[PDB]
Amino acid sequence: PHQVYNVTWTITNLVTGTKANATSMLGTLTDAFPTMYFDLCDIIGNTWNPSDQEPFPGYGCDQPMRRWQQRNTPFYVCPGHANRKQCGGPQDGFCAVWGCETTGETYWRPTSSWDYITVKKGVTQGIYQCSGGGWCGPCYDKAVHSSTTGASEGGRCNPLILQFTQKGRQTSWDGPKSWGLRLYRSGYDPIALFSVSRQVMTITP
Ligand SMILES: *[C@@H]1O[C@H](CO)[C@@H](O[C@@H]2O[C@H](CO)[C@@H](O)[C@H](O)[C@H]2NC(C)=O)[C@H](O)[C@H]1NC(C)=O
Ligand SMILES: *[C@@H]1O[C@H](CO)[C@@H](O[C@@H]2O[C@H](CO)[C@@H](O)[C@H](O)[C@H]2NC(C)=O)[C@H](O)[C@H]1NC(C)=O
Numbered sequence: 001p002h003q004v005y006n007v008t009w010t011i012t013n014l015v016t017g018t019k020a021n022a023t024s025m026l027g028t029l030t031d032a033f034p035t036m037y038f039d040l041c042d043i044i045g046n047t048w049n050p051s052d053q054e055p056f057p058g059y060g061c062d063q064p065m066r067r068w069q070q071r072n073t074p075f076y077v078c079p080g081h082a083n084r085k086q087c088g089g090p091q092d093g094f095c096a097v098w099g100c101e102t103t104g105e106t107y108w109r110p111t112s113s114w115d116y117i118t119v120k121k122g123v124t125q126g127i128y129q130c131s132g133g134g135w136c137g138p139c140y141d142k143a144v145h146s147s148t149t150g151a152s153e154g155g156r157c158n159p160l161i162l163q164f165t166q167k168g169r170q171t172s173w174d175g176p177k178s179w180g181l182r183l184y185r186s187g188y189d190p191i192a193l194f195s196v197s198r199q200v201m202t203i204t205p
Contacts, residue, residue: 002027004027005029006026007024007028007029007198008022009034010196010199011043011196013042013043013044013193013194014043014178014194020039021036033168037122039156039158039159041061041154041156042156045192048060048192056069058070059190064135064139064155067139071124071126071157071158075184076184078094078095078101078179078180080094080177080180080193081178081179092191093181093182093193094179094180095189105119105121106184114167116165116171116177117168118162119179120161122159124157127157128150130150137150137151138150138152139157140155179194180192181193
């Protein structure tokens with residue numbers, strides 16, 4: 001009865017244009033606001049991964065330990081849909097100055113009363129010593145070294161969870177909205193850009 005349409009929400013890698021993930025559900029524009037799930041490594045761009053000449057940088061999506069150390073690093077998120085000059089643009093992840101963040105996971109627990117979403121780390125076993133002392137866990141790509149237990153495809157172990165806020169559930173979604181995500185480190189804070197958009201189509205069969 002309330003299932004008038006098939007609403008699909010998509011999280012997009014801003015730079016590459018690829019789909020980090022998607023979720024569909026039946027309902028209306030006012031009640032279809034599902035919880036989204038995606039991995040950080042599916043939204044990074046060409047300039048995120050540290051160079052190969054760079055010794056144990058502490059983050060990155062191209063190597064298991066890089067992915068693991070990245071997982072244990074805090075991060076903050078800034079909206080790029082509000083046109084706040086002081087926060088800068090995509091090249092700053094919309095976080096040019098402190099106070100631009102509206103969510104994420106850091107010691108000061110950023111939240112917001114005006115932004116449309118919240119983003120927190122999901123659950124993962126990441127990496128752990130198992131049985132024979134070797135390293136086991138999802139951070140390892142099962143398609144790069146099978147046998148290594150826990151190994152997931154892609155080596156995904158940076159799950160993020162996105163939820164819509166009350167303000168988010170009440171704002172208009174005509175056109176995509178973008179956000180920037182930054183790792184909070186003692187040194188450069190790498191930038192990852194993503195977008196959220198909605199499609200509304202008829203049900204089938
Ligand atoms: C509309 O909703 C339906 C489910 O109610 C979606 O249909 C499934 O979509 C997945 C991929 O997203 C396919 O792998 C399944 O085979 C589809 N099931 C069938 C046969 O309906 C559909 O994707 C949604 N609209 C779209 C195409 O975005
Ligand atoms: C892509 O999105 C789907 C949801 O459409 C994710 O699947 C959900 O994952 C959570 C967390 O593990 C579970 O609690 C749900 O039960 C899952 N839902 C369904 C329908 O499977 C999926 O994990 C996401 N993929 C990635 C790598 O983020």
